[PDB]
Amino acid sequence: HHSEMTPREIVSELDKHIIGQDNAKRSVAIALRNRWRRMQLNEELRHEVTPKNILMIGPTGVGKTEIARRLAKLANAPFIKVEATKFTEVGKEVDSIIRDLTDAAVKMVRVQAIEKNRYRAEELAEERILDVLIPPPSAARQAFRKKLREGQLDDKEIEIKARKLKIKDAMKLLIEEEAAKLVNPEELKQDAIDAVEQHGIVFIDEIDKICKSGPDVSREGVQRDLLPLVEGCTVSTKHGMVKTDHILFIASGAFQIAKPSDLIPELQGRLPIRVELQALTTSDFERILTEPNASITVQYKALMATEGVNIEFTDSGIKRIAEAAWQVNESTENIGARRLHTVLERLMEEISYDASDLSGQNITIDADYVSKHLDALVADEDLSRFIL
Amino acid sequence: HHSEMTPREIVSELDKHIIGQDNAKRSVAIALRNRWRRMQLNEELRHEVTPKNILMIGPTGVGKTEIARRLAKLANAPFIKVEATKFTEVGYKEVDSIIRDLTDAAVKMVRVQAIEKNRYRAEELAEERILDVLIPPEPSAARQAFRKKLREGQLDDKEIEIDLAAAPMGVEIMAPPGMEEMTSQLQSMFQNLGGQKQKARKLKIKDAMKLLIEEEAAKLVNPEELKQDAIDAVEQHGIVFIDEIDKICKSGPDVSREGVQRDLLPLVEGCTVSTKHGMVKTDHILFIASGAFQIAKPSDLIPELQGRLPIRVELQALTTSDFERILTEPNASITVQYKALMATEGVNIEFTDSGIKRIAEAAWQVNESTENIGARRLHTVLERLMEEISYDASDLSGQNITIDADYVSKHLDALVADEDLSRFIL
Amino acid sequence: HHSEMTPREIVSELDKHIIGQDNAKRSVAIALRNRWRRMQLNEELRHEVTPKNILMIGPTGVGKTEIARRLAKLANAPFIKVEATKFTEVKEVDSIIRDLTDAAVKMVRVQAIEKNRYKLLIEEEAAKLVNPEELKQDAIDAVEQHGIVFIDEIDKICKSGPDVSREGVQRDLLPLVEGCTVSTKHGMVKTDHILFIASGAFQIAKPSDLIPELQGRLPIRVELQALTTSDFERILTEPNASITVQYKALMATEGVNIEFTDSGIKRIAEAAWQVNESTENIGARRLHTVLERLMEEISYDASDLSGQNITIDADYVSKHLDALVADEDLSRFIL
Amino acid sequence: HHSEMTPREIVSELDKHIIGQDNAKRSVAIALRNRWRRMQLNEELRHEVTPKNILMIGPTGVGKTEIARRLAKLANAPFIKVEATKFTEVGYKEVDSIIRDLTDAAVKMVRVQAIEKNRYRAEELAEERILDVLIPPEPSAARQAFRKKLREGQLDDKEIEIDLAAAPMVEIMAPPGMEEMTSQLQSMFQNLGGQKQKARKLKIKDAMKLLIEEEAAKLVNPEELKQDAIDAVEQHGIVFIDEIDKICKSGPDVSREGVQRDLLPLVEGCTVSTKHGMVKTDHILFIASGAFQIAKPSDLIPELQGRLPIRVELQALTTSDFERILTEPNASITVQYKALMATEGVNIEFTDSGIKRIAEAAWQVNESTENIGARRLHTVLERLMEEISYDASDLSGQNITIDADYVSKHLDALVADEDLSRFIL
Ligand SMILES: Nc1ncnc2c1ncn2[C@@H]1O[C@H](COP(=O)(O)OP(=O)(O)O)[C@@H](O)[C@H]1O
Ligand SMILES: Nc1ncnc2c1ncn2[C@@H]1O[C@H](COP(=O)(O)OP(=O)(O)O)[C@@H](O)[C@H]1O
Ligand SMILES: Nc1ncnc2c1ncn2[C@@H]1O[C@H](COP(=O)(O)OP(=O)(O)O)[C@@H](O)[C@H]1O
Ligand SMILES: Nc1ncnc2c1ncn2[C@@H]1O[C@H](COP(=O)(O)OP(=O)(O)O)[C@@H](O)[C@H]1O
């Protein structure tokens, strides 16, 4: 059901992925904790209590989206990201948010079912093999069970319409037959509805652009159409009837042009929690390259390891990589932490291409190797917009 | 099924939720009371007498919508709130959708009332079928043993194989956004025709119990009697609330603005609207409209609409004395909810009289310093005030936290004093 | 089948609801009587003879719509009212016949449920012998032969930029009056024999500003006089189930006997006449808002006033009204 | 089939309905005569020869549409009238809809022709199933006895229980564009539910007519009836496009000429899909009309001018023509008002001097304000007859004579005032 984690355990889990932005983490943790707190109340208070929506404020590239993505992934919750300006053009309907979110939940519950159906099909597949070895666990059945998993015993011929086969090729055929009987289409579609209603999470990006003569009537019309979603309503979908009352909504935006006070008063009352996010620094970039679990540099260490090349990133090399991304954002356009992705690939493109010929070597990326493939490019701002 | 409550008993019940706004409570009581007065007349007068619709006037956040919500909830009536500007575009949402979503809201209303009557019986037969798998076949011993262990025990995590019904079709249809409602109706037809059977599958008693209650409760209630009864709820008891009707009043946009009034005209004057649950007649449906009317006036409405809104009430703006009452008096007020939410973690929150008073002063000052959003400022102010407690409530378990006037001025006055920061955070 | 009533019998029944406007009652009586006259002709003349459509002219709130509603209710005919300006935006015009069919399906369905009730074995034969598709077929026969359509504010689509879009509504409405075949979910519907009644103020434009093809499809023209103070008094009392009789019976449910004096009925009408002259003239609709504001105190206290006789005089009217009617700024919001 | 009448026999028949406009009648007579002329040619010349489409020019109300209506009714051809401005919005209407409604008019036309032939076979099979209920089962005696008693006798008032078909089935919500589709889906569930007949008690009087309808559907093949209507549209189809002058030619000109480009594949010929099957528009005859006061036929796109070879100007009607329209045409408005008042028992008689002043009154209104053509005769007559039509119930058994004095009493007062003539007349 809903996870029992405390807000401190949720923020501690988010620190494995997002760097900094502790205030934003505490806001989503409190909202996720209220999901469990509402389950502990009586029947009257469960309907009266609605989720507390979060309005994030900050420049682009500070992690507003990754916090929401990891939260839904931490809460095992369906997630969708919608641009607020998509509805500005008009006839797309605003209800499409719930329609596409539901579709994401239907595929989610299917993959989670196949994951739980595989271990169940394999247990019953080898269980039917043990009936041929020892006709009816006692001893011999437990002996052939441990010898079938650990050993290469599968090469022996075993007759399992009865037909003779090899346990290696009979095991994969018995998994196909057992996995087809473990799926319930009715309970799968109903759980996808409960996933959207109870656990649903919706992230509305760049909601500041729809704030307030000609365009303002079109802008404030999106909020009036977004209003029944946050206040709760019924949306018809192909999969069934989806109620948005218990869905959590997380909005974000720059708010340089407008302010959250420019939103309609009915929407402000539906976005009670507000959190400002600080912009990232050069000291933060050095942290993002290494600290987060499966960071882009750790991934590249493992990717070249597939070819047999050991990549090592020195601190002086990581420092100039971070200094490179900061310089490009200042010289041209500030895209946030996304600059680290394009800068890392441009430096690593020569190693990634020749990695097949570098098998068996240890390549050390220092401050000098970084400045050779970068400083020439970072010096030209005209080249920095196309290449970086 | 019309409630016999007098106008004074209705206003007294509304006082349990809404604070003040006595004129608007007396308006909705008259409309609801006429529902019972009409049912006592002869056949000729029942059709000639039509509900008296209400046009509410007042600034935002004064409780216009909540009065309509509690009115329909008090009368056990289907209710829907629609924004008048939703139909300004006109290219598809249809104006008929107001009765459509009102019909579907009534079907769920009469369904939950049918589930509660069938609940204890469906749960009795659901667990009865579980006992047939545990002990294959007066109850003797083992059956009464597993029955008591199933209700009291957490043994539902065990694996049990029970036969259950399933729809073998499993077909998905691609549809453009307009056909999203229609294709779902086609999917229910193919499952209703061919498949009648039950297939043996392996489940867990925790998930198998909830799946058995749905199957047994469906057999107890008849769909033909329930679907036609919901239509009788929309025609007699239906209640519709049209928000921000002042924004559709009156060259370029005014033709599209007044077009919404023309489209809403057959609803209030009465007409026949087709729904998937049946044919619905809007003649006796009660309509309530609300608006600020700062830009326009009720005279700027089309003359055909003015006659269909005979009852007029303006609602007064809330004051600081009202904010102090809203924080406590109403049932399930925002402080009552937060008090119970922190109690989940084991923390006892207490709000002093002077603390509640300085919370209201903060919300009042923000509405004046920046933008007046009405009583909705109380949530943003309270959530900002309690965000430290709500995060630490896990570690504060077993402690009594008292919110005094000093605690309020510490976490708020700093923010309210700076107007530039007040707009972002509050 | 279809009831045969002389034009005087139609007007005499309309007098039980509408007050005055005798010129419009005589026009609608001719059209409904032609429904029975065409049934008595031969096969060749039935298709050649087309219904005579009516174009009504007059200010708002004079009873143009009530005359049409009571006419169809008297003939048990499907009725629909659509605003001509709804098609100014570039909804299809065929939706007029679609919503007319939907309203006729429920009409013949509710009327058929009563016939089946006229005890458990009789109801089991009612759910069997009655066919759901046969009711759909009976509705289509009611739309083609007896159908009545009312098009409000038709003068607003008269005639350079918007005039091409305004007159385009007339051109799209043309096949409906000339006759055509419109497809609906309930079946195929033919508009040849449907009666159409149009109305408008015609202060901005004139019927001559309509396209020439449309003028010939509206042979009957009638102007409705503006209601006066003497007419307002008659609307409060004379019509069957009048707004005052309704409010007299609603209070009677609580146990209170309400009586309206002749002096009060006169000043109630004078109050409504004063508001239409001071701010905006909404016609007889002003009586609805004025009555409710006068009776709002009695309607709320009717539970505690049970067993009492409350008499509404001219003094009680002047107490709850003259204060509000004198202030025009408040008259727009409250009245 | 294809009528063999000569151009002179066509025009002579059109004079029974339309008055004057001889140059236009000769144009439509040539186009209908070429339908028969092409039939007598060889296989190569039949396809190469295409119908000669007609463009009518003249003021409104001169009878352009009545010539097209009476022409198709004379040739027993499917006919449809469409306004050229209907497709200006082009939202969803597709121009292909002209052939769609034309096919539906042909299906109903050939269906009634199939009902008359199936009447004797259905009535034989309808009473055949009734005889199985009376005498349970060459005919021997009892079957031949009840057969002669059912046709000759009024014995149908007896209660007889016969089995008849019905379906248990549902409503579907759809946007206005799917209104035609959902009607087809509903018919498919009624056919799929089951094939059988439910037993119910009835009367032979009402059971015989209900048995004829069920048998008549089985006798006619839905593939033969549906495909025969396609042959009626391709060869005999006649389409009238009104006010084509309003789609002639910057901002509106792109949307106006866009209608001609969408109308172009219809006149040049193409394949249009209908619910009844595939229809080819190559040989369908098209007739266009317009006032052409604002624009000219040369303003049309060059590809459309080549597809409208026949050009005819229609003259404006005069006072002498209005006198003829009130009397000469079959089922004229004055004869129709004579029979309508006859239903109440009143005999109406129009004098020659009264008819003459009516025509002069209709001309004066067209001259004083706006000229709407012969349509003015409808409003002028109804205003004159409105007092008689209301009292027709109490005037039963009386003979009312409409003279020149009765015309000037109810009209000249109203016609003299031009401000009131616009509203009332
Ligand atoms: N605090 C952070 N820690 C780690 N990665 C981050 C952080 N902030 C941004 N990123 C990077 O930015 C990308 C996504 O940024 P996103 O959250 O979509 O920007 P925004 O906050 O403007 O929505 C991710 O690929 C991630 O690597
Ligand atoms: N008089 C009142 N008494 C209690 N709560 C109120 C009152 N007025 C407003 N509220 C609060 O404001 C919210 C309702 O605002 P709403 O009525 O929707 O705004 P509006 O009246 O502008 O439509 C509710 O959450 C309610 O708690
Ligand atoms: N002559 C009349 N007699 C009785 N009621 C009238 C009369 N004229 C107007 N009304 C009132 O006006 C309302 C309907 O007006 P309506 O006919 O819609 O206006 P319009 O004539 O502008 O269409 C009804 O509620 C009716 O009580
Ligand atoms: N020459 C005519 N003979 C008889 N009736 C006519 C004649 N011209 C017009 N009408 C009358 O006018 C109407 C037809 O006008 P129509 O042909 O549609 O106008 P247009 O010729 O401008 O398209 C019919 O009702 C018909 O009675």
Numbering used by the authors:
A (entry chain F): 0 to 90, 94 to 138, 152 to 175, 212 to 263, 268 to 443
B (entry chain E): 0 to 91, 94 to 138, 151 to 263, 268 to 443
C (entry chain D): 0 to 89, 94 to 121, 223 to 263, 268 to 443
D (entry chain C): 0 to 91, 94 to 138, 151 to 182, 184 to 263, 268 to 443
Q: Would you copy out the relevant sentences from the publication that reported this structure?
A:
HslUV consists of one or two AAA+ HslU6 ring hexamers and the double-ring HslV12 peptidase. ATP-dependent proteolysis requires HslU6 to bind the degrons of target proteins in its axial channel and then unfold and translocate the substrate into the proteolytic chamber of HslV12. To reach the axial channel of the HslU hexamer, substrates must transit a funnel-like structure formed by segments of its intermediate (I) domain. Here, we present evidence for a model in which HslU hexamers are autoinhibited at low temperatures by a trimeric I-domain plug that blocks the axial channel but melts at high temperatures to activate proteolysis.
We determined structures for three new crystal forms of E. coli HslU or HslUV by molecular replacement. Our new structures were similar to previous ones with the notable exception that a trimeric plug, formed by residues 183–206 of the I-domain, completely blocked the axial channel of the HslU ring. The plug consisted of amino acids from three of the six HslU subunits, each comprising an extended region (residues 183–188), a sharp turn (residues 189–191), and an α helix (residues 192–206). We could not reliably model connections between plug elements and other regions of the I-domain in specific subunits. The three α helices that comprise the plug center packed together via hydrophobic contacts involving the side chains of Met192, Met195, Leu199, and Phe203. Additional hydrophobic packing contacts within the plug included Val184 and Ile186 from the extended region, which occupy peripheral grooves between plug helices, and Met202 from the helix. A Pro189-Pro190-Gly191 tripeptide formed a sharp turn between the extended region and α helix of the plug. The negatively charged side chains of Glu193 and Glu194 following this turn were also close to the positively charged side chains of Arg101 (94% conserved) and Lys293 (92% conserved) in the HslU axial channel, suggesting that favorable electrostatic interactions also stabilize the plugged conformation. Because protein substrates must access the axial channel of HslU to be engaged, unfolded, and translocated into the peptidase chamber of HslV, this plug would inhibit substrate degradation. Hence, replacing the nonpolar Leu199 with a polar Gln199 in the L199QHslU variant should destabilize helix-helix packing and plug stability, thereby reducing autoinhibition and providing a structural rationale for the ability of L199QHslUV to degrade some protein substrates more rapidly than wild-type HslUV.
